[PDB]
């Protein structure tokens, strides 16, 4: 938020932008939490091709 | 019936022969009978000296579809 005129708080967008050091840190800390993803083989192999088409579109 | 044998032997034996040696093996009394035979055997001859000579992605999906039948 900021304050513009009256004078209320304008809402603003945000992001979490990892600087290289925080890239390294957040990575090294979140190593372990990574998911198992027990979905069957067909499920995974499906998720993939979905992702590929997505990339194609972009 | 014997000579082909030696031939069919020597094809795999070793790639490289002097013509006099082929005569020695095949029991020829003649030098020209040799390249007669070798042509009949399709052997490319150099001046007395003969010579006797699927993507991975696919593979993966193949293993899968073989598994999920």
Coordinates of N, CA and C in Angstrom, one line a residue:
Chain A
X1 N 0.8 -1.2 0.0 CA 0.0 0.0 0.0 C 0.9 1.2 0.0
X2 N 0.4 2.3 -0.7 CA 0.9 3.6 -0.5 C -0.3 4.5 -0.1
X3 N 0.0 5.8 -0.1 CA -1.0 6.8 0.3 C -1.0 7.9 -0.7
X4 N -2.1 8.1 -1.4 CA -2.3 9.1 -2.4 C -3.6 9.9 -2.1
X5 N -3.7 11.1 -2.6 CA -4.8 12.0 -2.3 C -6.0 11.6 -3.1
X6 N -8.0 14.3 1.5 CA -8.3 13.0 0.9 C -7.4 11.9 1.5
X7 N -6.4 11.6 0.7 CA -5.2 10.8 1.2 C -5.6 9.4 1.7
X8 N -5.9 8.4 0.9 CA -6.1 7.1 1.3 C -5.0 6.2 0.8
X9 N -5.1 4.9 1.1 CA -4.1 3.9 0.7 C -4.4 3.3 -0.6
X10 N -3.6 3.6 -1.7 CA -3.7 2.9 -2.9 C -3.1 1.5 -2.7
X11 N -3.9 0.5 -3.1 CA -3.4 -0.9 -3.2 C -2.4 -1.0 -4.3
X12 N -1.4 -1.9 -4.2 CA -0.5 -2.2 -5.2 C -0.2 -3.6 -5.3
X13 N 0.2 -4.1 -6.5 CA 0.6 -5.5 -6.6 C 1.9 -5.7 -6.0
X14 N 2.2 -7.0 -5.7 CA 3.5 -7.4 -5.1 C 4.0 -8.6 -5.8
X15 N 5.2 -9.0 -5.4 CA 5.8 -10.3 -5.8 C 6.9 -10.7 -4.8
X16 N 7.3 -11.9 -4.9 CA 8.5 -12.3 -4.1 C 9.6 -12.6 -5.1
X17 N 10.6 -11.7 -5.1 CA 11.6 -11.8 -6.1 C 12.9 -12.2 -5.4
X18 N 13.3 -13.5 -5.7 CA 14.4 -14.0 -5.0 C 15.7 -13.4 -5.6
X19 N 16.5 -12.7 -4.8 CA 17.8 -12.4 -5.3 C 18.6 -13.7 -5.2
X20 N 19.8 -13.7 -5.9 CA 20.6 -14.9 -6.0 C 20.8 -15.6 -4.7
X21 N 21.2 -14.8 -3.7 CA 21.4 -15.3 -2.3 C 20.2 -16.0 -1.8
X22 N 19.0 -15.4 -2.0 CA 17.8 -16.0 -1.5 C 17.3 -17.1 -2.4
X23 N 17.7 -17.1 -3.7 CA 17.5 -18.3 -4.5 C 18.2 -19.4 -3.8
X24 N 19.5 -19.2 -3.5 CA 20.3 -20.3 -2.9 C 19.7 -20.7 -1.6
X25 N 19.4 -19.8 -0.7 CA 18.9 -20.1 0.6 C 17.6 -20.8 0.5
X26 N 16.6 -20.2 -0.1 CA 15.2 -20.8 -0.1 C 15.3 -22.2 -0.7
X27 N 16.1 -22.3 -1.8 CA 16.3 -23.7 -2.4 C 16.8 -24.6 -1.3
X28 N 18.0 -24.3 -0.8 CA 18.7 -25.3 0.1 C 17.8 -25.6 1.3
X29 N 16.9 -24.7 1.7 CA 16.0 -25.0 2.8 C 14.8 -25.9 2.4
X30 N 14.3 -25.7 1.2 CA 13.2 -26.4 0.8 C 13.5 -27.6 0.0
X31 N 14.8 -28.1 0.0 CA 15.2 -29.3 -0.6 C 14.2 -30.4 -0.2
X32 N 14.0 -30.6 1.1 CA 13.4 -31.8 1.6 C 11.8 -31.9 1.4
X33 N 11.2 -30.7 1.4 CA 9.7 -30.7 1.4 C 9.2 -31.2 0.1
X34 N 10.0 -31.4 -0.9 CA 9.5 -31.8 -2.3 C 8.6 -33.0 -2.3
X35 N 7.6 -33.0 -3.1 CA 6.5 -33.9 -3.0 C 6.8 -35.3 -3.6
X36 N 6.1 -36.2 -3.1 CA 6.2 -37.6 -3.5 C 5.5 -37.8 -4.8
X37 N 4.2 -37.3 -4.9 CA 3.4 -37.4 -6.1 C 3.2 -38.9 -6.5
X38 N 2.3 -39.5 -5.7 CA 2.1 -41.0 -5.8 C 1.2 -41.3 -7.0
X39 N 0.7 -40.4 -7.8 CA -0.2 -40.7 -8.9 C 0.4 -41.7 -9.8
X40 N -0.4 -42.6 -10.4 CA 0.1 -43.7 -11.2 C 0.8 -43.2 -12.4
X41 N 1.6 -44.2 -13.0 CA 2.4 -43.9 -14.1 C 1.7 -43.1 -15.2
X42 N 0.5 -43.6 -15.6 CA -0.3 -42.9 -16.6 C -0.6 -41.5 -16.2
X43 N -0.8 -41.3 -14.9 CA -1.2 -39.9 -14.5 C 0.0 -39.0 -14.7
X44 N 1.2 -39.4 -14.2 CA 2.4 -38.6 -14.4 C 2.6 -38.3 -15.9
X45 N 2.7 -39.4 -16.7 CA 3.0 -39.3 -18.1 C 2.0 -38.4 -18.8
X46 N 0.8 -38.3 -18.2 CA -0.2 -37.4 -18.7 C 0.1 -36.0 -18.4
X47 N 0.4 -35.7 -17.1 CA 0.7 -34.4 -16.6 C 1.8 -33.8 -17.4
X48 N 2.7 -34.6 -17.8 CA 3.8 -34.1 -18.6 C 3.3 -33.5 -19.9
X49 N 2.7 -34.4 -20.8 CA 2.3 -33.9 -22.1 C 1.4 -32.7 -22.0
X50 N 0.6 -32.6 -21.0 CA -0.1 -31.4 -20.7 C 0.8 -30.2 -20.6
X51 N 1.9 -30.4 -19.8 CA 2.8 -29.3 -19.6 C 3.5 -28.9 -20.9
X52 N 3.9 -29.9 -21.7 CA 4.5 -29.6 -23.0 C 3.6 -28.8 -23.9
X53 N 2.3 -29.2 -24.0 CA 1.4 -28.4 -24.8 C 1.3 -26.9 -24.2
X54 N 1.2 -26.8 -22.9 CA 1.2 -25.5 -22.3 C 2.4 -24.7 -22.8
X55 N 3.6 -25.2 -22.7 CA 4.8 -24.5 -23.1 C 4.6 -24.1 -24.6
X56 N 4.2 -25.0 -25.4 CA 4.0 -24.7 -26.8 C 3.1 -23.5 -27.0
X57 N 2.0 -23.5 -26.3 CA 1.1 -22.3 -26.4 C 1.8 -21.0 -26.0
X58 N 2.5 -21.0 -24.9 CA 3.2 -19.8 -24.5 C 4.2 -19.3 -25.6
Chain B
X1 N 31.7 -79.1 -52.1 CA 31.1 -79.1 -50.8 C 32.0 -78.7 -49.7
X2 N 33.3 -79.0 -49.9 CA 34.3 -78.5 -48.9 C 34.6 -77.1 -49.0
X3 N 34.8 -76.6 -50.2 CA 35.5 -75.3 -50.4 C 34.6 -74.2 -49.8
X4 N 33.4 -74.1 -50.1 CA 32.5 -73.2 -49.5 C 32.6 -73.1 -48.0
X5 N 32.7 -74.3 -47.4 CA 33.0 -74.4 -46.0 C 34.1 -73.5 -45.6
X6 N 35.3 -73.9 -46.1 CA 36.5 -73.0 -45.9 C 36.1 -71.6 -46.2
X7 N 35.6 -71.3 -47.3 CA 35.1 -70.0 -47.7 C 34.1 -69.5 -46.5
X8 N 33.0 -70.2 -46.3 CA 32.1 -69.9 -45.3 C 32.8 -69.8 -43.9
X9 N 33.8 -70.6 -43.7 CA 34.7 -70.4 -42.6 C 35.4 -69.1 -42.7
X10 N 36.3 -69.0 -43.7 CA 37.2 -67.8 -43.7 C 36.5 -66.5 -43.8
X11 N 35.3 -66.4 -44.4 CA 34.6 -65.2 -44.3 C 34.6 -64.5 -43.0
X12 N 34.3 -65.3 -41.9 CA 34.4 -64.8 -40.6 C 35.8 -64.9 -40.0
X13 N 36.7 -65.7 -40.6 CA 38.0 -65.9 -40.0 C 38.7 -64.6 -39.8
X14 N 39.2 -64.1 -41.0 CA 39.9 -62.8 -41.0 C 39.8 -62.2 -42.4
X15 N 39.6 -60.8 -42.4 CA 39.1 -60.1 -43.5 C 40.1 -60.0 -44.7
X16 N 41.3 -60.5 -44.5 CA 42.4 -60.0 -45.3 C 43.2 -61.1 -45.8
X17 N 43.3 -61.3 -47.2 CA 44.1 -62.4 -47.7 C 44.9 -62.0 -48.9
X18 N 46.1 -62.4 -49.0 CA 46.8 -62.4 -50.3 C 46.3 -63.6 -51.1
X19 N 46.3 -63.3 -52.5 CA 45.7 -64.3 -53.4 C 46.4 -65.6 -53.3
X20 N 47.7 -65.7 -53.2 CA 48.4 -66.9 -53.1 C 47.9 -67.7 -51.9
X21 N 47.5 -67.0 -50.8 CA 47.1 -67.7 -49.6 C 45.7 -68.3 -49.9
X22 N 44.8 -67.6 -50.6 CA 43.5 -68.2 -50.9 C 43.8 -69.4 -51.7
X23 N 44.7 -69.4 -52.7 CA 45.0 -70.6 -53.4 C 45.5 -71.7 -52.5
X24 N 46.3 -71.3 -51.5 CA 46.7 -72.3 -50.5 C 45.6 -72.9 -49.8
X25 N 44.6 -72.1 -49.4 CA 43.5 -72.7 -48.6 C 42.6 -73.6 -49.4
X26 N 42.1 -73.0 -50.5 CA 41.0 -73.7 -51.2 C 41.5 -74.8 -52.1
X27 N 42.8 -75.1 -52.1 CA 43.4 -76.2 -52.8 C 43.3 -76.0 -54.4
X28 N 43.4 -74.8 -54.8 CA 43.5 -74.5 -56.2 C 44.9 -74.8 -56.7
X29 N 45.0 -75.3 -57.9 CA 46.2 -75.4 -58.7 C 46.4 -74.2 -59.6
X30 N 45.4 -73.2 -59.5 CA 45.4 -72.1 -60.4 C 45.2 -70.8 -59.7
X31 N 45.7 -69.8 -60.2 CA 45.6 -68.4 -59.7 C 44.2 -67.8 -60.1
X32 N 43.8 -68.0 -61.3 CA 42.6 -67.4 -61.8 C 41.3 -68.0 -61.3
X33 N 41.3 -69.3 -61.1 CA 40.2 -70.0 -60.4 C 39.8 -69.3 -59.1
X34 N 40.8 -68.7 -58.5 CA 40.6 -68.0 -57.2 C 39.5 -66.9 -57.5
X35 N 39.9 -65.8 -58.2 CA 38.9 -64.7 -58.3 C 37.7 -65.1 -59.1
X36 N 37.8 -66.2 -59.9 CA 36.5 -66.8 -60.3 C 35.7 -67.1 -59.1
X37 N 36.2 -67.9 -58.2 CA 35.4 -68.3 -57.0 C 35.0 -67.1 -56.2
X38 N 35.9 -66.1 -56.0 CA 35.6 -65.0 -55.1 C 34.5 -64.1 -55.7
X39 N 34.6 -63.9 -57.1 CA 33.4 -63.2 -57.7 C 32.2 -64.0 -57.5
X40 N 32.2 -65.3 -57.8 CA 31.1 -66.2 -57.4 C 30.7 -66.1 -56.0
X41 N 31.7 -65.7 -55.1 CA 31.4 -65.4 -53.7 C 31.2 -64.0 -53.4
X42 N 31.2 -63.1 -54.5 CA 31.0 -61.7 -54.4 C 32.1 -61.0 -53.6
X43 N 33.3 -61.5 -53.5 CA 34.3 -61.0 -52.7 C 35.0 -59.8 -53.4
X44 N 34.9 -58.6 -53.0 CA 35.7 -57.5 -53.6 C 37.2 -57.7 -53.4
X45 N 37.9 -57.6 -54.5 CA 39.3 -58.0 -54.5 C 40.1 -56.8 -54.8
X46 N 41.2 -56.6 -54.0 CA 42.1 -55.5 -54.3 C 43.4 -56.1 -54.6
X47 N 43.8 -56.2 -55.8 CA 45.2 -56.5 -56.3 C 45.8 -57.6 -55.5
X48 N 45.3 -58.8 -55.6 CA 45.8 -60.0 -55.0 C 45.3 -60.1 -53.5
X49 N 44.6 -59.1 -53.0 CA 44.4 -59.0 -51.6 C 42.9 -58.7 -51.3
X50 N 42.2 -59.6 -50.7 CA 40.8 -59.6 -50.6 C 40.3 -59.1 -49.3
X51 N 39.2 -58.4 -49.3 CA 38.5 -58.0 -48.1 C 37.2 -58.7 -48.0
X52 N 36.8 -59.1 -46.8 CA 35.6 -59.9 -46.6 C 34.4 -59.2 -46.2
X53 N 34.4 -57.9 -46.0 CA 33.2 -57.1 -45.6 C 32.7 -56.3 -46.8
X54 N 16.0 -45.5 -33.3 CA 14.9 -45.6 -32.3 C 15.2 -44.7 -31.1
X55 N 14.5 -43.6 -31.0 CA 14.8 -42.6 -30.0 C 14.5 -43.1 -28.6
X56 N 15.1 -42.5 -27.6 CA 14.9 -43.0 -26.2 C 13.5 -42.7 -25.7
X57 N 13.0 -41.5 -26.0 CA 11.6 -41.2 -25.6 C 10.7 -42.3 -26.0
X58 N 10.7 -42.7 -27.3 CA 10.0 -43.8 -27.8 C 10.2 -45.0 -26.9
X59 N 11.4 -45.4 -26.5 CA 11.6 -46.5 -25.7 C 10.9 -46.4 -24.4
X60 N 10.9 -45.2 -23.8 CA 10.3 -45.0 -22.5 C 8.8 -45.3 -22.6
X61 N 8.1 -44.5 -23.5 CA 6.7 -44.8 -23.6 C 6.4 -46.2 -23.9
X62 N 7.3 -46.9 -24.7 CA 7.1 -48.3 -25.0 C 7.0 -49.1 -23.7
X63 N 8.0 -48.8 -22.8 CA 8.0 -49.6 -21.6 C 6.7 -49.3 -20.8
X64 N 6.3 -48.0 -20.8 CA 5.0 -47.7 -20.1 C 3.9 -48.5 -20.6
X65 N 3.5 -48.3 -21.9 CA 2.4 -48.9 -22.5 C 2.5 -50.4 -22.4
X66 N 3.7 -51.0 -22.3 CA 3.8 -52.4 -22.0 C 3.4 -52.6 -20.6
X67 N 3.6 -51.6 -19.7 CA 3.3 -51.9 -18.3 C 1.8 -51.8 -18.0
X68 N 1.1 -50.8 -18.6 CA -0.2 -50.5 -18.2 C -1.3 -51.2 -18.9
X69 N -1.0 -52.1 -19.8 CA -2.0 -53.0 -20.4 C -2.7 -53.8 -19.3

